[PDB]
Symmetry: D2
Subunit: 116 residues, 4 copies
């Protein structure tokens, strides 16, 4: 699993379950091309987005539909979504965990980048 | 000042000075149109991006160039930028403060929304 | 004002108003002695806790009563309080802004330290 | 594992390894009694702090020695440590994950509280 996304809920203190997200890769003409997508599991994690051979260097965007998550809980949110945009670097061996911590009017995101 | 952005550096414990950002508004054809731009001051704040007359209802995107900020400090950060996307003014004019807290592999954003 | 504390509500997207906090200083016998206290204003800020003469070198603790804040809003939070413990002024007088961002099951704190 | 602590490094984008922490429980006379301790593993996690039979309702404090972590990396930190103080509640079945995200001048902590 070269890329995993984990989402947490800071209001209920729980994994954020059934959060939908799309992953895009920047194309030559500076447009965003769909790459992968899915929804978080009961653990708040989304695995199996890509494979090592497909996950080449490039600029990737993870668009997390936070608004739909809060709407389903009956809570008015600020953001339309959370976008995480990053360059994937193959100068070393690197697995990526993107974690997002969600509140209605705030979110934080961090990258845990580890070498196998 | 209906829209202000404040940027902080969590490594140095300081305002994030001279951070560029661009603000976009979603047009009727679902494209992002340029709306305003500027750089943070010595206090880490960017004021005067817009006016009450110009800041109509809509979906706005603030793209904060965090990558250039860290690179100039000698750090290779994870993110290309910090994006904040939100619907503004859809129940009337509000005042928005967007705050971003920056680390090389993490950022957080929050909104303070007040009614004049 | 060498010490200011700002508290924000990440659920409502607002300053956290009327939040009590106590400041302690570590005494020579390693006990915590009361140093100052107060409540945040309508802007979520607490100014005037101390003076430059009184704010000597030492280890300080700010204990922010986040639990009472959430309880009065009908929420049972995780934390009893948000504590910030730091050495102050040990290379000369600095100005400290402690900012706390609150959610029911999460908080973040950051410091902005400036040299007068 | 009724209680697990995970620590992440927002400067290097990695688990925070070999971070020492002590867990305390509030005693009848309002003093902090040692309860458990350990250091994070290569994954940034500390498991096996307590057992279900020993982890009774009460006020617990997790004191994470963040200062020693940053000092070992040659980075000047703001906080003496990060204290997470919370009430453990047995009104339902509850496993606790305390996660801390560390920067030199900022930290965030959240609780993921799940039912087995
Ligand atoms: C921005 C942010 C801050 C804190 C968290 C966070 O609390 C968290 C919790 C987990 O159970 C967990 O497995 C991870 N992880 O692997 O990165 C992070 C998640 C995101
Ligand atoms: C995401 C996040 C978390 C904490 C901060 C933060 O530390 C901060 C500090 C200030 O002096 C201040 O005036 C504000 N503000 O008005 O929103 C925020 C900034 C951003």
């Amino acid at each position: 699993c070269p890329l995993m996304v984990k989402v947490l809920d800071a209001v209920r203190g729980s994994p954020a379950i059934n959060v939908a997200m799309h992953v895009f890769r920047k194309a030559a003409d500076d447009t965003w091309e769909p790459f992968a997508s899915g929804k978080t599991s009961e653990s708040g994690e989304l695995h199996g987005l890509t494979t090592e051979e497909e996950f080449v260097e490039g600029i990737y965007k993870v668009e997390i539909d936070t608004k739909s998550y809060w709407k389903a809980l009956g809570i008015s949110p600020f953001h339309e979504h959370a976008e995480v945009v990053f360059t994937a670097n193959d100068s070393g061996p690197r697995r990526y965990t993107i974690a997002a911590l969600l509140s209605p009017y705030s979110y934080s995101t961090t990258a845990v980048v580890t070498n196998p």
